[PDB]
Design an enzyme around this catalytic site. Structure first.
Site, mmCIF file in Angstrom:
data_model
loop_
_atom_site.group_PDB
_atom_site.id
_atom_site.type_symbol
_atom_site.label_atom_id
_atom_site.label_comp_id
_atom_site.label_asym_id
_atom_site.label_seq_id
_atom_site.Cartn_x
_atom_site.Cartn_y
_atom_site.Cartn_z
ATOM 1 N N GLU A 133 1.746 -0.151 2.861
ATOM 2 C CA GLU A 133 1.784 -1.574 3.207
ATOM 3 C C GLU A 133 1.235 -1.988 4.591
ATOM 4 O O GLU A 133 2.030 -2.469 5.438
ATOM 5 C CB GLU A 133 3.252 -2.102 3.056
ATOM 6 C CG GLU A 133 3.751 -1.961 1.598
ATOM 7 C CD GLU A 133 5.059 -2.648 1.329
ATOM 8 O OE1 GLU A 133 5.699 -3.219 2.267
ATOM 9 O OE2 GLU A 133 5.518 -2.656 0.152
ATOM 10 N N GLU A 250 4.875 0.583 -6.311
ATOM 11 C CA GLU A 250 6.260 0.114 -6.228
ATOM 12 C C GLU A 250 6.383 -1.156 -7.044
ATOM 13 O O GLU A 250 5.466 -2.014 -7.020
ATOM 14 C CB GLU A 250 6.656 -0.317 -4.828
ATOM 15 C CG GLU A 250 6.691 0.853 -3.796
ATOM 16 C CD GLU A 250 7.176 0.412 -2.461
ATOM 17 O OE1 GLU A 250 7.774 -0.681 -2.284
ATOM 18 O OE2 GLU A 250 6.936 1.196 -1.490
#
Length: 308
Positions: A133, A250
């Site tokens: 991220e 995810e």
């Protein structure tokens, strides 16, 4: 062939709140060796292991990773490979890099030189995910440059393992169209974290500002479904145009969301990802978004069936 590697990855689960905390166990989970038998027996093809290498390496050159931590990572990887699971390892929660990517560029690249040197001869079912991220001062344009530098370091040492490349602006779909993977690199998978609608999946999440205002949000109407399909169609069209496989590394809904809505969202997202032949990993095994209770040694049957 990264598309073959994507098929090998298949359906997985994240063992989170573990090695990406400052110390393993601080966030509630220690990776037990038996977890690999549990996960393989349930039908998963891989595990994703978030790892906060940046707190286990010195801050001064050559930024050496600490011995005890390297040995622990090796134990986890080999534990999973013993069961025939594929394994994704990453650099997770390297906050200093996000806040000042110029200062931490060389240290980040030294971590990858060391991780690639450690695992270059491990099996082809181990995957290297460059950075979890990217966000903040590591903007989309700076991430395109930094990820290419990381590819060069890794490929200078290892031309065998598939590399996984995320998107900026926190790793979702927002910045997908800004992502550029260099044409010279031919064995990478692009990863997206899918938590939309964010207000539904993170309702009540204690680390998320103002999430208490989302508590009670439901999910499951035909319009909710259509909206999600539209976003999946956008990712699929990007994949086809750019000729890169997709891994949804995810996805999951927090335990404060009502269980029926969580089952409906998780089951729908998995059916839709599978129709597109994407690999995927649920967030996460046994804690706040969990589907397995480590005390009772039982899975939430409905959420497991949603995942399969």
């Amino acid at each position: 062939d990264p598309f073959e590697r994507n098929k090998i990855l298949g359906r997985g689960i994240n063992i989170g709140n573990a090695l990406e905390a400052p110390n393993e166990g601080d966030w509630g989970v220690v990776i037990k060796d038996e977890f690999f038998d549990i996960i393989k027996e349930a039908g998963f093809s891989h595990v994703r292991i978030p790892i906060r290498w940046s707190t286990h390496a010195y801050a001064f050159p050559p930024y050496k990773i600490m011995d005890r931590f390297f040995k622990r990572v090796d134990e986890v990887i080999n534990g999973a490979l013993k069961r025939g699971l594929a394994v994704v390892i990453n650099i997770h929660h390297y906050e200093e890099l996000m806040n000042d990517p110029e200062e931490h560029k060389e240290r980040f690249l030294a971590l990858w030189k060391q991780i690639a040197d450690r695992y270059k001869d491990y099996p082809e079912t181990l995957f290297f995910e460059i950075l979890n991220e990217p966000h903040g001062n590591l903007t989309p344009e700076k991430w395109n440059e930094l990820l290419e530098e990381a590819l060069k370091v890794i490929r200078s040492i290892d031309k065998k393992h598939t590399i996984i490349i995320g998107t900026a602006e926190w790793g979702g779909i927002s910045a997908l169209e800004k992502l550029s993977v260099p044409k010279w690199e031919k064995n990478s998978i692009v990863t997206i974290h899918y938590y939309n609608p964010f207000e539904f999946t993170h309702q009540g999440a204690e680390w998320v500002e103002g999430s208490e205002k989302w508590l009670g949000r439901k999910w499951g109407s035909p319009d909710d479904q259509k909206h999600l399909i539209e976003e999946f169609n956008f990712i699929e069209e990007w994949s086809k145009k750019n000729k890169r496989p997709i891994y949804i590394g995810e996805f999951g809904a927090y335990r404060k969301a009502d269980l029926e809505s969580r089952i409906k969202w998780t089951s729908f997202v998995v059916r839709e990802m599978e129709k597109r032949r994407w690999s995927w990993a649920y967030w996460e095994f046994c804690s706040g978004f969990g589907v397995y209770d480590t005390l009772r040694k039982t899975w939430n049957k409905d959420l497991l069936e949603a995942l399969i």
